[PDB]
């Protein structure tokens, strides 16, 4: 049937908690390498390029 | 309003505003033309059979029986009471 629960209601606050964790995890060199990115020549993990 | 939650005149105190009512509330007011036309038709038409029975009862001074008969024909106590007074007036007009 098309009555099946296709969409999931996630609490706003667990979405924001996870988004902050994802941003924090983006600032760790081991977590970039363990994912599979080629960051061997990146000076600092929060790579900020002048706008 | 007394400004209290309970009591006789309970309610928040406010300044009442006095204004003439809506014109739609003026319904039920007998205009002079309507009363004139209804008098002409009343003479031409006459009386319903049940009205004539009540007037006979009223003339014999059987007021309770006249009201009971008027109630059964009309349906309600209020309409019967109003009709009996109306019939009592037309009796008076006929006998000057």
């Amino acid at each position: 049937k098309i009555w099946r629960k296709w969409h999931v209601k996630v609490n706003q606050g667990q979405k924001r908690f996870a988004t902050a964790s994802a941003l924090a995890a983006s600032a760790a060199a081991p977590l970039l390498m363990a994912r599979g990115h080629q960051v061997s020549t990146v000076p600092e993990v929060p790579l900020v390029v002048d706008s | 309003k007394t400004g209290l939650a309970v009591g006789l005149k309970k309610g928040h105190k406010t300044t009442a505003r006095v204004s003439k009512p809506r014109v739609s509330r003026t319904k039920g007011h007998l205009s002079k033309r309507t009363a004139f036309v209804r008098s002409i038709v009343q003479e031409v038409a006459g009386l319903a059979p049940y009205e004539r029975r009540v007037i006979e009862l009223l003339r014999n001074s059987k007021d309770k029986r006249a009201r009971k008969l008027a109630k059964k024909r009309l349906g309600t106590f209020g309409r019967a009471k109003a009709k009996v007074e109306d019939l009592q007036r037309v009796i008076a007009e006929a006998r000057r």
Binding site: - | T2, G7, L8, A16, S19
Partner: protein, 213 residues
């Protein structure tokens, strides 16, 4: 077929409900189309605001009378006091409600000043720009910095009166003489016994006292 310490079910699913199941998969699609309709209406209505001015009304029950909201339209008493003809207000973005009645001067006064405030900020272009009339806004007064929606600027500002007032100890209000609890108990008893006291006033003995001189 109850088996354990359950809550007794209340599932009204015995009437072939599967034929009348409405699933809202077009919630996102309807929202996008509503915004497209709103944009088209605004473009056609420019430079007029997309909505109409509405009065402040008080909610009609003891549960909600503490709060005010927006009404349907301005009553004829409010419009007449503000100095706007009844059949001119709809042409300038004002909502008219002939059914509503004003029983208090306070609510009437609050809506009249709102009508005058809107009238002050309103610019009316001439029916033909070549020859402006008395009631048309002059060319210099027109500026071009207009507003999109009236209800954003003319919404409710304080729907519920604040409860954070602070007063000097000198201005401390006095107490109820018999006690506020007793004031409520006495008020309830008066309403409960209003008919009994009136019946005995007016008593058969009082009528007998009236009869017996």
């Amino acid at each position: 077929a109850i088996k354990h310490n359950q809550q007794i079910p209340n599932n009204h699913f015995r009437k072939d409900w599967q034929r009348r199941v409405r699933c809202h998969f077009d919630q996102a699609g309807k929202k996008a189309s509503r915004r497209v309709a709103r944009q088209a209406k605004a473009a056609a209505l420019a430079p007029r605001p997309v909505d109409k001015l509405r009065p402040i009304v008080r909610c009609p029950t003891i549960k909600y009378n503490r709060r005010t909201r927006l009404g349907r339209g301005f009553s004829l008493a409010e419009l007449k006091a503000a100095g706007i003809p009844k059949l001119v207000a709809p042409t300038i973005g004002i909502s008219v409600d002939p059914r509503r009645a004003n029983l208090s001067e306070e609510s009437l006064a609050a809506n009249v000043e709102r009508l005058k405030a809107y009238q002050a900020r309103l610019v009316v272009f001439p029916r033909k720009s070549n020859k402006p009339k008395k009631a048309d806004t002059p060319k210099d007064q027109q500026t071009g910095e207009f507003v999109k929606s009236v209800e954003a600027v003319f919404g409710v500002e304080r729907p519920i009166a604040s409860g954070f007032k602070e007063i000097p100890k000198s201005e401390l209000p006095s107490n109820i003489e018999g006690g506020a609890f007793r004031a409520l108990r006495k008020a309830r008893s008066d309403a409960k016994l209003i008919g009994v006291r009136e019946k005995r006033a007016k008593d058969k003995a009082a009528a007998e006292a009236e009869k017996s001189k």
